[PDB]
Design a protein around this ligand. Structure first.
Ligand code: AGS
Ligand code: AGS
Ligand code: AGS
Lengths: 346, 7, 344, 178
């Protein structure tokens, strides 16, 4: 048997929250991949197609988290590569082919088992040209790597060193999935240019900003492939990635849920840290909402939340080891502000 | 190794 | 043996939307082989070389024509890439390797390899952009390729050797098909010829109309325009034949989803058939899809995005759903305003 | 037994004066680093988090001094690299992997003992984008550098050149960065 979309999403819900739009996209691909791997190249329609996912979302939205959690529940092999080291035209550093060689470490040199693998890349936005269609100095990670990757996604065979005779092996990529996604920077400015159409000075010029317009979530939703051309991406590279997933910015309610519901929620991690010391740690509901408000102001995502918690308990952590006969510690909403000190129980 | 050229 | 009438029909079976391009290839393909039948024996001296230069947008079928032609043609065919090519072979590749792969397809048959065809994808990659320089993918690659395209005998170890000998395989007989997507070329042609911006009452102004920019502009391309792009003039001089491909029409898109055996509807419905539920698409949905696809301006390759995103919700919950004999999709489903209605 | 924030702070006071808030941050990080390592592999709270440090201050204020004094009392390996001599996409300058190579020299090429080490970087503002508002081109040692460090701080084995053409893989998810 194979896992169902509802079953895999219930597993992802334990580790991810507030990304319903993105969970369904990854579910259909995994379902499609297993269905493609269910039949032994026998189907009513020949030349089964391949769909590539393009994950796009704000900073710290949970993109890197999905690729990690996916490999845990995924039975087939999975790799987590990076576009930072890709060296087009064989320059010093890692090469596109490396991604394939890395996929054998997880598959243990199994070609038949490797062709049915999944691939994930990160920081794909970083390899885009600086909003210029013609490249002046032949960018190695601009007009370069982006082109080099086209052959792999399209489907070809690349020689790979078997070990570290000295003969090579050929493995096709036509039936291998690739998930290339990264938080694009400055994309909102380009989208605004093509959709606001209200710039200018005058009585009849619709100019209302910083209150209603320029929403990060709404702008990304209206994205189209033509918009990425002005950003720097080549249309050929976008053509190989038909599917697009638009994540949203974490809401105030989402932050509260992420503080408690996840298995590795920060609140639970600190409790574990305090638990070994021998003092229990409890967070009062009122206090939790205050932390969420501060996080949104920073505009750093979920990752930035650690900063607020660390500063709030920085003083207590310093004095907790020297103190003795402490059973429970309670944190109040005022403590987050820093005006008051958390109470202690002996 | 690589090449650098800018101004 | 070559037939221009039949070959056009054969390409029509696998390719749709490019009628003018099929006529150009049939003439060059027929002329090139006819030349080799009687090599330099006619009275006409200094016969022009017969080559091909494919130029079209993304998803126009450049890579498709090379695949279909290889299957129909009897001589061995090769599919190389210009990105891998490097000069003086430091770590990437060498130009001579292209000949080695050709022999593997021809099984070390020099007589059968000289009459082969060559197709290089992403020709724009080798464009010389050395403003800020050494350059391994720029002038060095084009210079080496031009030497080979001119026609010269290159040493190639047959089978690799168990010898210190190499074979002098000719190159003038072998055909070459340089093709790839040209980005920014339209702007160059538009920059040279605009014939507009008239402020007078008599003068006319066209802001949206661009005189069929996708197809007409390509038809009026000149060699001098490619020189400003980065290519070498001698390289363009060796290719008198250029193929221009217009943007796919909405009518062509509908045909591509029904006539081919690799159609999205056929594979997707086949996938649904494995699950056990039939998939039905109405004609109203097809034309609606074409309009959305043309708006994206991504070609056929981006067509899948509209079809998959629309069916994302349906496929997500289809396995859990039961007692559904058939699936019916209406035109509104393509827009996404109305959810599709299942049949029980 | 293990040290304490009051004990580690009394040691730093001998070499640093007039910095109350700065000493508290470093003490908690070091004091918390030993806990995360020990509570490894079936600790009730799985997937323990990480919290790096970003020191900011004027010139000649004692930033570089804290990194040096810490290595004297820190048993686990420590190094002092810089971001000025760094370039992305394998350029003429040293690549990001270099930092990890220096750690093994002090650790005696111990992969198990290298993951539990601490790392320090000086002059981080140099790689900062120099107000490059117009997207004229891509920097070689600026914005690009930061991009390559993203995957490092979260954790991903990339490469280790051993003093044999087979490289070694070193986890960096648990490594601290200052
Ligand atoms: N939806 C979410 N639910 C719970 N925690 C989340 C969620 N999204 C992010 N986080 C937290 O943020 C951490 C980092 O998430 P990431 O996947 O790295 O986000 P990101 O969008 O990939 O950031 P980038 O792309 O690397 S800049 C996770 O380890 C979680 O602690
Ligand atoms: N002219 C066309 N007619 C029908 N289907 C097409 C056409 N062009 C592309 N397709 C579809 O798109 C798929 C890939 O087409 P490609 O030829 O690879 O696109 P391409 O733009 O020519 O590739 P490049 O740019 O040369 S790398 C084919 O398998 C078809 O399903
Ligand atoms: N708190 C301090 N107590 C005593 N001496 C100090 C203190 N801070 C700085 N110094 C002196 O300043 C010298 C240099 O300190 P640094 O750590 O280099 O300061 P800095 O701010 O790091 O300068 P940078 O980082 O190179 S711009 C030390 O060797 C000490 O002599």
């Amino acid at each position: 048997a194979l896992p169902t979309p509802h079953e895999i999403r219930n597993h992802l819900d334990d580790y991810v929250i507030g990304q319903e739009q993105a969970k369904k996209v990854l579910a259909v691909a995994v379902y499609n991949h297993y269905k493609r791997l269910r039949n032994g190249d026998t189907s009513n329609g020949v030349e089964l197609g391949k769909s590539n996912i393009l994950l796009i979302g704000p900073t710290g939205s949970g993109k890197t988290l999905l690729a990690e959690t996916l490999a845990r529940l995924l039975d087939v092999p999975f790799t987590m590569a990076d576009a930072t080291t890709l060296t087009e035209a064989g320059y010093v550093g890692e090469d596109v082919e490396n991604i394939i060689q890395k996929l054998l470490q997880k598959s243990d040199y199994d070609v038949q088992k490797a062709q049915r693998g999944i691939v994930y890349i990160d920081q794909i936005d970083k390899i885009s040209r600086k909003s210029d269609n013609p490249s002046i100095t032949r960018d190695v990670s601009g007009e370069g790597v982006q082109q080099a990757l086209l052959k792999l996604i399209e489907g070809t065979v690349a020689a790979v060193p078997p070990q570290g005779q000295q003969e090579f092996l050929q493995v096709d990529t036509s039936k291998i999935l690739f998930i290339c996604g990264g938080a694009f920077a400055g994309l909102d400015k380009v989208i605004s240019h093509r959709v606001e159409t209200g710039s200018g000075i005058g009585f009849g010029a619709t100019v209302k900003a910083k209150s209603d317009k320029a929403s990060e979530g709404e702008l990304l939703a209206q994205v189209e492939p033509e918009d990425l051309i002005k950003f720097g991406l080549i249309p050929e590279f976008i053509g190989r990635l038909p599917v697009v997933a638009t994540l949203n910015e974490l809401s105030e309610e989402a932050l509260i849920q992420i503080l408690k519901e996840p298995k590795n929620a920060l609140t639970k991690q600190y409790q574990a840290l305090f638990n070994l010391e021998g003092v229990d740690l409890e967070f009062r509901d009122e206090a939790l909402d205050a932390i969420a408000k501060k996080a949104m102001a920073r505009k750093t995502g979920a990752r930035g939340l650690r900063s607020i918690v660390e500063a709030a308990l920085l003083d207590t952590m310093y004095d907790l080891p020297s103190m003795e006969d402490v059973e429970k510690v309670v944190i109040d909403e005022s403590v987050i502000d820093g005006q008051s000190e958390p109470l202690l129980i002996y | 190794x690589x090449h650098x050229x800018x101004x």
